[PDB]
Enzyme design. Structure first.
Site, PDB file in Angstrom:
ATOM      1  N   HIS A 158      12.201  36.500  13.189  1.00 23.87           N
ATOM      2  CA  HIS A 158      11.990  36.270  11.767  1.00 23.87           C
ATOM      3  C   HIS A 158      10.533  35.927  11.419  1.00 23.87           C
ATOM      4  O   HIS A 158      10.200  35.895  10.258  1.00 23.87           O
ATOM      5  CB  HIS A 158      13.003  35.260  11.169  1.00 23.87           C
ATOM      6  CG  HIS A 158      12.667  33.818  11.367  1.00 23.87           C
ATOM      7  ND1 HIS A 158      13.203  33.049  12.387  1.00 23.87           N
ATOM      8  CD2 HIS A 158      11.883  32.978  10.635  1.00 23.87           C
ATOM      9  CE1 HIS A 158      12.742  31.809  12.274  1.00 23.87           C
ATOM     10  NE2 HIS A 158      11.938  31.738  11.233  1.00 23.87           N
TER      11      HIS A 158
ATOM     12  N   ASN B 275      -5.653  20.390  16.000  1.00 24.96           N
ATOM     13  CA  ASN B 275      -5.835  20.471  14.539  1.00 24.96           C
ATOM     14  C   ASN B 275      -6.073  21.945  14.172  1.00 24.96           C
ATOM     15  O   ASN B 275      -7.095  22.525  14.553  1.00 24.96           O
ATOM     16  CB  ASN B 275      -6.986  19.595  14.077  1.00 24.96           C
ATOM     17  CG  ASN B 275      -7.020  19.473  12.585  1.00 24.96           C
ATOM     18  OD1 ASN B 275      -6.868  20.445  11.856  1.00 24.96           O
ATOM     19  ND2 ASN B 275      -7.242  18.249  12.093  1.00 24.96           N
TER      20      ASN B 275
ATOM     21  N   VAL C 150      -9.435  22.674  12.065  1.00 22.17           N
ATOM     22  CA  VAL C 150     -10.731  22.223  12.570  1.00 22.17           C
ATOM     23  C   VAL C 150     -10.929  22.896  13.923  1.00 22.17           C
ATOM     24  O   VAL C 150     -10.044  22.843  14.782  1.00 22.17           O
ATOM     25  CB  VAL C 150     -10.794  20.705  12.752  1.00 22.17           C
ATOM     26  CG1 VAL C 150     -12.173  20.250  13.285  1.00 22.17           C
ATOM     27  CG2 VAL C 150     -10.554  19.974  11.412  1.00 22.17           C
TER      28      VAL C 150
ATOM     29  N   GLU D   1      -9.987  26.160  21.604  1.00 20.64           N
ATOM     30  CA  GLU D   1      -9.267  27.282  21.051  1.00 20.64           C
ATOM     31  C   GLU D   1      -9.600  28.577  21.770  1.00 20.64           C
ATOM     32  O   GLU D   1     -10.752  28.804  22.186  1.00 20.64           O
ATOM     33  CB  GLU D   1      -9.615  27.471  19.567  1.00 20.64           C
ATOM     34  CG  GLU D   1      -9.218  26.314  18.649  1.00 20.64           C
ATOM     35  CD  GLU D   1     -10.229  25.212  18.489  1.00 20.64           C
ATOM     36  OE1 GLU D   1     -11.246  25.179  19.211  1.00 20.64           O
ATOM     37  OE2 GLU D   1      -9.947  24.393  17.594  1.00 20.64           O
TER      38      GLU D   1
ATOM     39  N   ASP E  43      17.297  36.338  17.476  1.00 21.12           N
ATOM     40  CA  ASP E  43      16.061  35.958  16.767  1.00 21.12           C
ATOM     41  C   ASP E  43      14.956  35.684  17.778  1.00 21.12           C
ATOM     42  O   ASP E  43      14.592  34.549  18.062  1.00 21.12           O
ATOM     43  CB  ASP E  43      16.308  34.762  15.875  1.00 21.12           C
ATOM     44  CG  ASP E  43      15.158  34.465  14.956  1.00 21.12           C
ATOM     45  OD1 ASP E  43      14.260  35.365  14.811  1.00 21.12           O
ATOM     46  OD2 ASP E  43      15.130  33.363  14.335  1.00 21.12           O
TER      47      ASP E  43
ATOM     48  N   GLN F  65      10.653  24.168   8.471  1.00 23.81           N
ATOM     49  CA  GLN F  65       9.825  25.298   8.060  1.00 23.81           C
ATOM     50  C   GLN F  65       8.423  25.178   8.628  1.00 23.81           C
ATOM     51  O   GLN F  65       7.842  24.117   8.554  1.00 23.81           O
ATOM     52  CB  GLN F  65       9.765  25.356   6.503  1.00 23.81           C
ATOM     53  CG  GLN F  65      11.053  25.908   5.768  1.00 23.81           C
ATOM     54  CD  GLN F  65      12.367  25.073   5.821  1.00 23.81           C
ATOM     55  OE1 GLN F  65      12.365  23.937   5.487  1.00 23.81           O
ATOM     56  NE2 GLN F  65      13.486  25.739   6.036  1.00 23.81           N
ATOM     57  N   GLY F  66       7.919  26.269   9.180  1.00 24.14           N
ATOM     58  CA  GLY F  66       6.603  26.283   9.809  1.00 24.14           C
ATOM     59  C   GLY F  66       6.623  25.999  11.290  1.00 24.14           C
ATOM     60  O   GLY F  66       5.668  26.323  11.989  1.00 24.14           O
TER      61      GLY F  66
ATOM     62  N   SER G 297       9.127  27.422  12.960  1.00 22.70           N
ATOM     63  CA  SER G 297       9.787  28.670  13.325  1.00 22.70           C
ATOM     64  C   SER G 297       9.044  29.420  14.414  1.00 22.70           C
ATOM     65  O   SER G 297       7.836  29.562  14.312  1.00 22.70           O
ATOM     66  CB  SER G 297       9.806  29.628  12.097  1.00 22.70           C
ATOM     67  OG  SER G 297      10.698  29.198  11.128  1.00 22.70           O
ATOM     68  N   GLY G 298       9.787  29.887  15.408  1.00 19.79           N
ATOM     69  CA  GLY G 298       9.177  30.659  16.485  1.00 19.79           C
ATOM     70  C   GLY G 298       8.690  29.828  17.646  1.00 19.79           C
ATOM     71  O   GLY G 298       8.385  30.378  18.702  1.00 19.79           O
TER      72      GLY G 298
HETATM   73 CA   LIG Z   1      -8.387  23.820  15.976  1.00 13.83          CA
END
Ligand SMILES: [Ca+2]
Length: 223
Positions: free
Chosen positions: A40, A54, A57, A62, A84, A174-175, A177-178
């Protein structure tokens, strides 16, 4: 995540954020090239963001890697959310070190009562809306199939399980998900659905990853 805790930066090294100009779903890194998420959560133009704490930021750990392909499960039904699950291939391999790491697939399904870790950047409120910037965590048990079916009559398939707290107050939302449900170091669930968030007698419902290991392996082997 409602009723959870701040994980701590890079303490959940397999957690990814799927970004299409903004965070929209979680996912789990399962090897240097591949992410598991919910069907979904499918859309085109996904950038996978690994090493995040974060999400607003740049903090120094990352890796942002565009998806080259998305494969929704062949039998996904978006009305029932049966099956799903979706795989996303990265255009380049992630660099793996202790802050960015894959999570193992299960070799056996987990049982009701097992404790797991659920994580994500989704809403932290059960009424109204607040989205965190840093990753949130929740420890929660898998619930019995019978309690899950009783909570959601007519809706729980063999490819789903419930986890959380029937009393309410602690759930994914919500958010989230996955994103992952990890139990004893194995990816056993994917945040899939529920009625609201953290409501009494309405636990979270999760894709039962152990049913899909064959499909995941064979798909990776040929894509
Ligand atoms: Ca970050």
């Amino acid at each position: 995540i409602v009723g959870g805790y701040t994980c701590g930066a890079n303490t959940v090294p397999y957690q990814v954020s799927l970004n299409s100009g903004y965070h929209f779903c979680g996912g789990s890194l399962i090897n240097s090239q591949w992410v598991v998420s919910a069907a979904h959560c499918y859309k085109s133009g996904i950038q996978v963001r690994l090493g995040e704490d974060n999400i607003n930021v740049v903090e120094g750990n990352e890796q942002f890697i565009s998806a080259s392909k998305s494969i929704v499960h062949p039998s996904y039904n978006s009305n029932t959310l049966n099956n799903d699950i979706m795989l996303i291939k990265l255009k380049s391999a992630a660099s793996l070190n202790s802050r960015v790491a894959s999570i193992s697939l299960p070799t056996s399904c987990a049982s009701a009562g097992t404790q797991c870790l659920i994580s994500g950047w989704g809403n932290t409120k059960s009424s109204g809306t607040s989205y965190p910037d840093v990753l949130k965590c929740l420890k929660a048990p898998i619930l019995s199939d019978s309690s899950c079916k009783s909570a959601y009559p007519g809706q729980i398939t063999s490819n789903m399980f419930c986890a959380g707290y029937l009393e309410g107050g602690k759930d994914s939302c919500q958010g989230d998900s996955g994103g992952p449900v990890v139990c004893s170091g194995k990816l056993q669930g994917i945040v899939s659905w529920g009625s609201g968030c953290a409501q009494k007698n309405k636990p979270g419902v999760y894709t039962k990853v152990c049913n899909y290991v064959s499909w995941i392996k064979q798909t990776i082997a040929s894509n």
